[PDB]
Design a protein around this nucleic acid. Structure first.
Length: 213
DNA sequence: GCAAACGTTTGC
DNA sequence: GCAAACGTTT
């Protein structure tokens, strides 16, 4: 674990070594933009913007990616709903339920699954307003996704419209599935990932690991 | 000539 | 009244 300083909130950004190559420039960028961003009340709170950089990449082979945080109640961990109230994580969980067969769970969290990194493309939004901070995160979102793509061998993207042309942001031909936003083809997406992983000679994902009991 | 942008459906 | 996907558009 390392740490860097930025001019505006949250002042200190704590990151895992794997992200080193990218921080210098993330700081340049955030310093240009935080000024405005922070004038809006955000989801998540600024202290939580970057907590997912505390996550290692070395041990990750899938990235499950959505466009930006939940309009309200973002925790800084993508997809996470601690009280299991958010529509998107609940639907993901029904999906995983049906593949695995596990039907008696209490919640679900993509961020506790081995080899998986859940990700928000944009790192914050204005409270109640989806994609409202796209222009602030723009180059940062790109910088980071390219970095994640150097480590994972499958990028799974939720949202046909937004990620229709996600390839245009990438510097390699990484395997990329573009599914629907969480709103029965989704099942097929989580299983094809494992098919692809094996064909490519890699360990599959135990999606049942996400379950909270 | 697609990859855009607009409008319509319908799902939350 | 929203946000996403889809079907025609330029």
């Amino acid at each position: 674990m390392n740490s860097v300083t930025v001019s505006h909130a949250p002042y200190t950004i704590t990151y895992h070594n794997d992200w080193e190559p990218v921080m210098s420039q993330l700081v340049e960028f955030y310093n240009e933009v935080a000024s405005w961003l922070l004038r809006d009340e955000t989801s998540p709170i600024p202290d939580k913007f970057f907590i997912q950089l505390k996550q290692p990449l070395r041990n990750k082979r899938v990235c499950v990616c959505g466009i930006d945080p939940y309009p309200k109640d973002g925790t800084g961990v993508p997809f996470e709903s601690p009280n299991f109230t958010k529509k998107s994580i609940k639907e993901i969980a029904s999906s995983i339920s049906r593949l695995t067969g596990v039907i008696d769970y209490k919640g679900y969290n993509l961020n506790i699954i081995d080899g998986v990194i859940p990700w928000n493309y944009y790192l914050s939004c204005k409270l109640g307003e989806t994609k409202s901070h796209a222009i602030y995160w723009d180059k940062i979102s790109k910088l980071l996704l390219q970095h994640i793509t150097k480590h994972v061998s499958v990028l799974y993207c939720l949202g046909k419209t937004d990620f229709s042309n996600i390839r245009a942001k990438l510097e390699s031909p990484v395997t990329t599935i573009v599914g629907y936003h969480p709103a029965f083809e989704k099942d097929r997406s989580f299983e094809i990932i494992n098919v692809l992983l094996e064909l490519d000679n890699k360990a599959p994902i135990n999606w049942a690991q996400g379950f909270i009991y």
